[PDB]
Amino acid sequence: IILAFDIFGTVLDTSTVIQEFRNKQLEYTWLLTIMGKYVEFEEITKITLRYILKVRGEESKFDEELNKWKNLKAYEDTKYLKEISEIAEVYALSNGSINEVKQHLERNGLLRYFKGIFSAESVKEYKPSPKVYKYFLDSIGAKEAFLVSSNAFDVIGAKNAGMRSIFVNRKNTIVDPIGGKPDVIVNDFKELYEWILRYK
Template identity: 70%
Template sequence: MTVLAFDIFGTVLDTSEIIQEFRTKQLEYTWLLTLMGKYMDFEEITKRALMHVLKSRHEEHRFEEELRKWRNLKAYKDAIYLKDISKLVDIYALSNGSVNEVREHLNRNGLLSYFKGIFSAESVKEYKPSPKVYKYFMSSIKDEDAYLVSSNPFDVIGAKNAGMKAIYVNRRNLIVDPLDYEPDVTVRDFEELYKWISNKKG
């Protein structure tokens, strides 16, 4: 049976409205901490990354406003297809965000009921693209036909490196630099993903 593990930030939730320098710094912190063998809660990383960027702009007064934007991210419009996808296959969340944070985001956007479960990097105390994150999911699900679904190229590469299949959602029409790890499937959006699953099931 096919199982899909959806990345959340940037794949299900649209991060284009937040300061992109902040998003980049947030990811940079997760990578640095993992490489250094240290761990910090993702929400704390988010706050520190945001404050760093705002301080560099001399805009610390915008901290609460920008943090609210992050906490109220909207799902992409094509997320409506998650309902139909969930009727064909089991879908899970696989995120750097904490279980509680991801649950709140999905619930706020009316998507939570479509997911069978939420898996977080907090369980292994390392962040994507650490192999531990993907292997934790695969060992928990025990399904050989498990795919990561992500619009973040580094995430796709991380999943493939860990021995997991991957579907690249090419939302921004980017050329992936795969480091010899090509996605198994590439789609433009969740509508195309739904069609692919329908054909696969058929």
Template identity: 25%
Template sequence: MLKRRDFLKMTSAAAAMGMVSTVPGKSTSGDYKTKVVAFDAFALFNANSVVAAVEKMFPKRGAALSLAWRAAQFEYTWLRNSMGKYDNFWNVTRSALRHAARASDIAINDAQSDELMQSYLSLRAWPDAAQTLDRLKEANIRLAILSNFTLDMMRHCVVSSGLEGKLDALLSTDEVGFFKPAPLAYRIATTAFKVTRPEVLFVAFGGWDAVGAKAYGYRTYWANRASAASEDMGYQPDANSASLDRLVSFATTGNS
């Protein structure tokens, strides 16, 4: 039997994109000039510290609970897109934690929930993040985070990760009331910077996000840090690497 999680992985992107009528994205092949690089938050911020916090609170059960929590986070965003019932990512993350704890048969009180939620306000940067941002900035490319995170979550993590002053904009899906991969969520970047879709290079952490951005019409770099299998949705990222090591070359020359 097809499990809900597997079903959501296959259908959520299509369902969310079908909710909003948009003009199909232009082809991203051929001539281009990267004017903006927009990062998903997790492409810059390492969430492994959340796993450590959960393990400390629930020894020997932290890894499983963290995995269930992370899965529920994204399931809930996709479900809310499909239902047309948006709530911000902070609230979604808290709801996902409660669900994951129940599903894992772990009792968690409000104080424990609050403590674990705070871990999402102090994420550290991946080791290659700061240098990559600096090199892109030297190439006169504008930089942004385009994320389901709330602005408050992003601002806290920019400080905790030491990336202050390296980004031109923090763009939250709260602006439009749809989570990625809904087209309106990706449109935030073209609206904010007044550029066309092929002029934006989107850096995804999740394969589903790479697919969503590509379907919208962005050139897409998948920072596949988890070495995950690619999605089978009819779209593939333009570049795929386990880190940001090839991003600057791809953004400036088109070669990955």
């Protein structure tokens, strides 16, 4: 089986940055996509951080807060990417640039587990645009591939684009996302690994 892992919020825990910043960054990827105006992910991050800090009167904290984003830590259970990569084909599919995603994965000792890295930047539209998921599927000549994500909107995006989905329910929600039920639900990457062993 072929797995495309979302990165921010799925592999990386974004709890350590300012939540208004994390939320606004995401919002801007959506609004810019709708407006047909492509901006690189790193520039969206800079613009959103500067705006949120301005709102807060904390302009002086820019480098400090950007450093926190640079230094995001992976969830403990992501170590299971080792076991997973030996029984499944592991890719990243992120809004982040290829280079940024590689950076985070390397810092966290996870890059070695990935067969490939794909970015929404490559199609100049952000998730949940179908252009993103279809470009992944077409790139590796797949069809049956699962999008693995802890972001409800990303799971639904994948579904919409005809990709199967595995929702990694990190925040222990008990209500199904809006837009339908994911194909598979697990709580973390250990459970993901166990699921794959039972499925293959």
